[PDB]
Amino acid sequence: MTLPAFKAYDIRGRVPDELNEDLARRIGVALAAQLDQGPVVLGHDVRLASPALQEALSAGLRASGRDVIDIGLCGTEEVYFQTDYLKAAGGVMVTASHNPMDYNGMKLVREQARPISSDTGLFAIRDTVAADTAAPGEPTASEQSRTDKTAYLEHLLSYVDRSTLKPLKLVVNAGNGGAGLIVDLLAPHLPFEFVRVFHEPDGNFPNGIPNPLLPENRDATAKAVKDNGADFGIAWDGDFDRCFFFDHTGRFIEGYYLVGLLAQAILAKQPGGKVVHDPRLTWNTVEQVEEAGGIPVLCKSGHAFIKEKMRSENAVYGGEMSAHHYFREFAYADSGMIPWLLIAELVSQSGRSLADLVEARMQKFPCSGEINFKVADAKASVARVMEHYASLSPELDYTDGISADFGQWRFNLRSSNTEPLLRLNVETRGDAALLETRTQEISNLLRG
């Protein structure tokens, strides 16, 4: 038995049996022993238990001599940004994404907001916490409240030339998470008219836990766009490190296509740079990056792998189709805010709608959408897929599960690192029929 809340990438579990104030305090103590010198930034999301868990983390950190910088209710990217900006030793964001109401969690970073993951400190914290029967000591360091968002907001706005922006009408859907607070702080500096949907932070989640991928939640943004004639819409998850785009027809744009589009937007500002992308869906990104004079860099999926590869490559931008977009000067971190500012600037400057910006790309590299499978035997199921296709001799790559490139179509098939699932992505060279027949064929094999 090990504490189940400790996952590969972060901590998450049901309160109070898998995560509670006692464990939170012990995590703070253990984190203090894992970090280089300096204070620790703490922030939390809108969930009802988040402040108390953060307080417990603070008590454990301060009992271990760490000054705490409490940045308050915020998004995950604000913990990243402030940890790096203030040159802190590390940071913790108290958040659970789209987990049930009785769940919470923590995302931990060290210096420069470098992720702490299972094999880079998180399981060391787990093992310390698991064995810690010490009496809780008393605080020896202090907590300061630092809710000034000025440097954060200036950083976000530095990505666009405000004088080129047009008064676009934008639907924004925080899903009752925290994104609306940042939208409202940016709004005085922008010419846009916002149509605010599910805007107020509310950890009771009266309109559902924030997950723009669920069709009922997707449709709320789509309807607001259509009914208001908005140029485009943006929705976020609760901690707003993920962003989801809807064109002026209400159509949700698959996150794959935002990677190539945002890469081109960044490459116009930082020419010739490297762009990091995941292996799930690739061909459109590679082509668009190259077309814009950048250099694409294939990387395993998962935010910590993306960030590490961006650092080693001095990459200007990285993007995953799972709705995460990473920016070198933003501490190599992901932001749910930078992407829509860039897209709004692109629409403003080009005179093209978001739909037009992506339409030809979606026709040229149609994709299945990510299809998930919980099967009895994942390894045997993957083996059945590969055995079926062996006679076509695809080019195989093992960066992240199995990528198989057949020429006019390819797939990526991999185990998720956040759920016990297999994830399938298929794309083709402009061939919707081949896309469907191969996707259904693989699905049948996986379910066999």
Ligand SMILES: O=P(O)(O)OC[C@H]1O[C@H](O)[C@@H](O)[C@@H](O)[C@@H]1O
């Ligand atoms: O497909 P997976 O392995 O479940 O990860 C899905 C996503 O989970 C989180 O949102 C982040 O860690 C992302 O970096 C990752 O892409």
Ligand SMILES: [Ca+2]
């Ligand atoms: Ca998130």
